[PDB]
């Protein structure tokens, strides 16, 4: 049946760098954007929600506006790639990619953030 | 928009009893079992996958084999009813019903399990 896959179920990224998290789903010939739903989430916070060709910004969590982007070029290749810029320790956790495209599936991804002591200390105080 | 709703987001159950957890979804005009996808989950363990007309269970977790079923005749009324028989302390946690029906939404449901000392002891010690 319709199956979402990830080339990587674990990412280890460096504090302050950018990460792109990949999420593949089958596309026959070309994408029908009006049939597509892409839901990126991270432990119960909505990061991105792409419904039938355009994103719903009313539900996006404030922490991810201005840092999260759905690479819509990769959408047509069947790759719902999430890009987070300026990765912080609070971005460590479990991510879920959910696609509805004539069928529905989801996959989990775990992000670990390596950080130097100064950055961990500031996060530690908050 | 396609909204999934729950009449209750919290269930309290007695150890060893049966629980039936409910998710409602909008059925516009006649139910098209072909376009319906239902996932029941609990702390990222898969309980049920209902993919276009039938139950997929080769992805169903151990902890719910022989105990979980989707109440299929409720589907016509827009009701994704998950029934767990022989409820155990480890059934406590946060559940998720995820529904794809020409729109996609999920809701969370917390379950608490009351239990007598002995049941709690065996589960605590394991
Ligand atoms: O459940 C959701 N909620 C919000 N968006 C989306 S896109 C795809 C899904 C989905 C639904 C059921 C099973 C597998 C995936 C989904």
Largest CA distance in chain A: 51
Reading phi first (left if > 0) and then psi (alpha if -120 to 50, else beta), residue B55 is in: beta
CA distances from B117 to A85, B11, B89, B126 (A): 50, 20, 12, 14
Residues from chain B contacting residue A98 (CB–CB below 8 Å): 98, 104, 106
Smallest Cα–Cα separation from A51: which of B26, B96, B75, B3?
Answer: B3
Here the CATH number for the domain that contains residue A61 is 2.60.40.10
Compute CA A35 distance to the chain's CA centroid, rounded to the nearest angstrom: 19
Residues from chain B contacting residue A39 (CB–CB below 8 Å): 104
What distance in Å separates the CA atoms of residue B40 and residue B95, rounded to the nearest whole number? 7
Quote the tokens at residue B113: 């399990």
Smallest Cα–Cα separation from A91: which of A23, A38, A39, A45?
Answer: A45
Domain count across chain B: 1
Query: What DSSP letter does each residue of A31-50 carry, written as one string?
Result: --GGG-EEEEEETTEEEEEE
Query: Where in the sequence is the domain holding A6, given as residue range(s)?
Result: 1-126
Task: Report the structure determination method.
Answer: X-ray
Name A106's bridge partners. A98
Distance from CA of B57 to the nearest CA of A (A): 13
Distance from CA of B104 to the nearest CA of A (A): 7
Quote the tokens at residue A82: 């999430």
Report CB contact under 8 Å: B37, A94.
no
């Amino acid at each position: 049946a319709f199956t979402v896959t990830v080339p990587k179920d674990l990412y280890v990224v460096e504090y302050g760098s950018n990460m792109t998290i990949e999420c593949k789903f089958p596309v026959e010939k070309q994408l029908d954007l009006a049939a597509l739903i892409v839901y990126w989430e991270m432990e119960d916070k909505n990061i991105i929600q792409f419904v039938h060709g355009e994103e719903d910004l009313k539900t996006q969590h404030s922490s991810y506006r201005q840092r999260a982007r759905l690479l819509k070029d990769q959408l047509s290749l069947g790759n719902a790639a999430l890009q987070i810029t300026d990765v912080k320790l609070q971005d460590a956790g479990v991510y879920r990619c959910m696609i509805s495209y004539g069928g529905a599936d989801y996959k989990r991804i775990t992000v670990k953030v390596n950080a130097p002591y100064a950055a961990a200390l500031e996060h530690h105080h908050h």
